[PDB]
Amino acid sequence: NADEVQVAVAANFTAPIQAIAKEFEKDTGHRLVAAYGATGQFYTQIKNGAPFQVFLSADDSTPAKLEQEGEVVPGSRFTYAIGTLALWSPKAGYVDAEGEVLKSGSFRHLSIANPKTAPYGLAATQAMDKLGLAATLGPKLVEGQNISQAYQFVSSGNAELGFVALSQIYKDGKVATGSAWIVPTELHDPIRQDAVILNKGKDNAAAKALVDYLKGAKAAALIKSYGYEL
Ligand SMILES: [N+]
């Protein structure tokens, strides 16, 4: 069978890439083999020799930092998605339509991803900041090691609500489940998610097919189906 593509995938984009890989494999005959986790954790793994050949980041600074450190194919970095951040519980109406629960709520645990490694976690800390609520919300925070773990804390009842990726609650034009407030962008840095071809993916055929496929129509339609822009 054809060249495989080792892809490091930021946790928010787990479900999206699983769906992309099926059509990608159907369409190119290259196999996408993915690992899922926090962006900063892949920065570490990639610096240490991880076999990954493509890196789908939840930010743009980290693929850019890797390029200025000699780990990236120049000309390879592009934006493949722009995410959105939402406050969310599976309990309906608990997270009101204007996010007033943050200001008046009585919750004890507020799930965010580790903002030192997970950009959807950093967007959460930015928004609390610009919302004027950092000092009051700080003690209630509970950090997952990536945005999938933060979401599971909420989904499992280990916290009353959390800042989750829109990708995890959104399908086909709508939040699908529980209670959400869409964080308005003026509160955090836009979640520009960049891809990059790493040194081990230079002159690999699965890798070029993959970045070209992520810019194609089957890919673009699925990415928009999960609430991402462009
Ligand atoms: N959990």
Numbering used by the authors: 22 to 251
Can you provide the manuscript's text about this entry?
Metal binding results in a 22° relative rotation of the two lobes with the oxyanions coordinated by four residues, that contribute six hydrogen bonds, distinct from ModA orthologues that feature an additional oxyanion-binding residue. In this study, we investigated the interaction of P. aeruginosa ModA with oxyanions of the group 6 elements: Cr, Mo, and W. By combining biochemical, structural, and molecular dynamic analyses of ModA-metal complexes, we show that the SBP is permissive for binding all three oxyanions at the primary metal-binding site. Despite E. coli ModA having a high affinity for MoO, it has been shown to be permissive for binding to tungstate (WO42−; henceforth WO), the oxyanion form of tungsten (W), a group 6 element with similar chemistry to molybdenum. In P. aeruginosa, exposure to WO reduced MoO acquisition, which was attributed to competition between the two metal ions for the ModA SBP and the inappropriate sensing of W by ModE, thereby leading to repression of the modABC operon. The result was a depletion in cellular Mo, with concomitant impacts on nitrate reductase activity and inhibition of anaerobic growth in WO-supplemented media.
Acquisition of the trace-element molybdenum via the high-affinity ATP-binding cassette permease ModABC is essential for Pseudomonas aeruginosa respiration in anaerobic and microaerophilic environments. Molybdenum, which predominantly occurs as the oxyanion molybdate (MoO42−; henceforth MoO), is imported via the high-affinity ATP-binding cassette (ABC) permease, ModABC in P. aeruginosa. Pseudomonas aeruginosa PAO1 ModA has a non-contiguous dual-hinged bilobal structure with a single metal-binding site positioned between the two domains.
